[PDB]
Amino acid sequence: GSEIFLASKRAAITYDTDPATGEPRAWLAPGGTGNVVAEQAGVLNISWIASADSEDDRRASALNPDGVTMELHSGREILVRLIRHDPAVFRNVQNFMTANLMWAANNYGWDRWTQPSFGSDAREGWADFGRFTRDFADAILKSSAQSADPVYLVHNYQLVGVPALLREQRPDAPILLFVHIPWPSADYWRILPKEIRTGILHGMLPATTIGFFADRWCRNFLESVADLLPDARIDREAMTVEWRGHRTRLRTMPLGYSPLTLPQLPEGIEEWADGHRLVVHSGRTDPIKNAERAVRAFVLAARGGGLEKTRMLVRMNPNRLYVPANADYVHRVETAVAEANAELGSDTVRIDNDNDVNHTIACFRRADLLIFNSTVDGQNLSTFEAPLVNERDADVILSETCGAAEVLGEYCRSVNPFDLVEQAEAISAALAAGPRQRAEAAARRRDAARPWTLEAWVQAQLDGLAADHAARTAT
Amino acid sequence: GSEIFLASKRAAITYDTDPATGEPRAWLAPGGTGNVVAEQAGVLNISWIASADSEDDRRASALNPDGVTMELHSGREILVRLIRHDPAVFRNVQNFMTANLMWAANNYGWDRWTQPSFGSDAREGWADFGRFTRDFADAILKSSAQSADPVYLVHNYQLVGVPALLREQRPDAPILLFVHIPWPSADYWRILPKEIRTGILHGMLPATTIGFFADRWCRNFLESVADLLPDARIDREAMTVEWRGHRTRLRTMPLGYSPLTLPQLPEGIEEWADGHRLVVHSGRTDPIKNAERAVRAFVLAARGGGLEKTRMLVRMNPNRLYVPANADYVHRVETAVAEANAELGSDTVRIDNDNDVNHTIACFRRADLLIFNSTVDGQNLSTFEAPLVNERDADVILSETCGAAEVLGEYCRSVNPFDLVEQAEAISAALAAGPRQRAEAAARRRDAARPWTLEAWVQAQLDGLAADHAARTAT
């Protein structure tokens, strides 16, 4: 029976009051990673350590300092411990991860000619990240003080410094670090200031296993290590790092969707889309989602004819609008949608900006063509969800730089996300395709997407960690 | 006796009139590559094929379509053949090579989030590049039609398509291709439209040898091949590619300086610099030269004290001012220099913009600190010339992303060109260093730079090509 200690940037908890008694309730959101880990076979118990990121979170942590036991179905339970970081440190590290710095570092945001220019702001953000990293390590370790053989699962890029600190106190523990975002090319990674580009590698490599969604990110990580750490010896075939006694295995662990996640359309959208084939692009208000280039490509396609009764919905998820790169991205999309309507006709392209996840699934079902043309994406789960719920045999245009292209690229229209001509031709070809060809393609697409569930991904992590821990013990 | 056929974008020829007779003269500029190749031992004769890029070049070409024999010293000669391309095709290919496209592709200019967006303009530029590529191949082959065992030396990025066309007609010939600019990471190279990113590789790989200035570019090239061509088999150790029968060797061939290049200062500059230590940043009007970040770093250093009697000259070489990225780069430097003077005092930082190699060498000699902090640079020969002529024991700040850092990085202050804090600290430390420490460092620096001459680089090319041709013949 494994004793699991899961660390992640957030533990999705819903806070409200009971509709009958009014007593305050806090219970876990279904479909989380912790809820799935607790269901696995070799799991005796599980603790979930995450950050307090709301005012409710701060009360819950202060009022239950060592963690609260939350009941799942089937009589399972998790000890959820929320860390109350320093407010000033937390807010700076949160800015440290946005496109103001670290997001642009791992999601290919800088042109090098004009950006970035690291000042004292980067040195202070890095110092605050260290304090934030120790906050997690001490909490994880204190939560696992009484465990004989704790198993550590460290998720999200915010925790890349945690493995070294865990290994410092627990030399023999299995430590998995999983990064949900891409790893950039060695030349791109070393844009970062020296203390950050090397210090981040020093924090991850003591892990037993480092997991990414895609082979490409594992490859770039290995090249970044070989480039920056001369005493490190990499093996691209075996996917391993040898560094100061640490043996580290790099693993690709693709994720697709959670069945528990898979309603009506947003207000006005159904009537607006009536009588028209509906092109749908969906994604967060993040520059990587590439909705501006999608809109331009839809215009280049419409100039080629055949799109007279076709409209485009740019479904958008508001997130971190306070980041200049995100707001600018919305502004650039709004411009392109304005110019698209100014040439093709009023109400040809529409933007819908909201958090209703049911509205997005409703858009997935209605779509006649799905565009997921990210400039880069750690994986992009929407490109798995959308074909699985779409009952219209919609084609899928998928960027080759999405992590999901390694799994689904053969079953989609794979495109260079920077080439408007190629993307316009894919839009035109996808809509010219007949009903029978689209139906057979969508069946092959759904079959390729179905196996990549949350549970299989968690099983991949545990089995993978178990095997590399056995290996690291022998070597 | 080898029969050499050198191809390059330009053959530097000076046209004017005799000061006594007035008859028009056309003779080769000393120190060119062709003049040095003709001087080697195993060279019986040599033909130099290049583009006509002036009106004098066009009249010279029209009047000698098969080439004009130009006399060198010691009774040697080269057949210089200038190609008269189609003006509309030529002008489009020149734009194809500028930062409007291909320069940004190999010199890391795009942020991916907002640039680039390839339209029909890229498809047409590529078609014109093909026509331009055939112009060179037929000219090279027609110049080598009567040669029994021709040796082909193809220089400059404009000719990356030439090796395949030569190999098409001369299956057994030694073909060297040398690229003077960096090769980007595989993830970055594949920004380009599919027909370009693969078609450029298809044109390069039939070469017997592909040469770069730095190990990093050879590595990135190999990774680009392995990523884009599944039938290609690379060997990172042996530095080779196996593709459709072609055996291709990748070689690093560093170049430093030409002794023939190594006077009066620019007007006003000597008096302006009198009584002050002079920081000197020199480079073309190209965004990669990074003069904007150098000026900001000089300001961060000056805020730390110790620079009260120090001034900095941003020496600039106008080149392709018609390119938006170059003009914007000049504008951004002017802004930074304006704000530097508005904070530290009038006439602290000065820009000197003109094309005069003698003025730049004079600035090299006067400098007390040299900054060559390129965002990226294929090699950067200025970082070799400047310490070799500087008689003031000036320190050298050298960007780690310059190809020259592979040779001189250990002997300079190597910096991350994007970190203003690190670069400011290097400026401060370089100016705080005492006379004796700087003198021993400059002596070691000159000793490391001295062997990398033009002649040694040409010998590297011929010896390297000879060895790879013997290997390719056996296999």
Ligand SMILES: Nc1nc2c(ncn2[C@@H]2O[C@H](COP(=O)(O)OP(=O)(O)O)[C@@H](O)[C@H]2O)c(=O)[nH]1
């Ligand atoms: N909360 C919320 N989630 C959404 C919305 N639209 C889509 N989603 C979900 O967010 C996820 C998108 O993740 P992914 O495509 O990997 O891109 P990410 O933003 O980088 O995680 C999918 O599971 C969607 O079902 C929305 O409006 N609100």
Ligand SMILES: Nc1nc2c(ncn2[C@@H]2O[C@H](COP(=O)(O)OP(=O)(O)O)[C@@H](O)[C@H]2O)c(=O)[nH]1
């Ligand atoms: N024609 C001309 N050449 C210059 C000037 N200033 C410097 N140079 C030379 O141009 C060369 C610079 O090359 P390099 O540093 O490799 O950068 P590149 O411009 O990208 O090739 C050096 O040989 C300098 O001596 C100038 O004002 N005019």
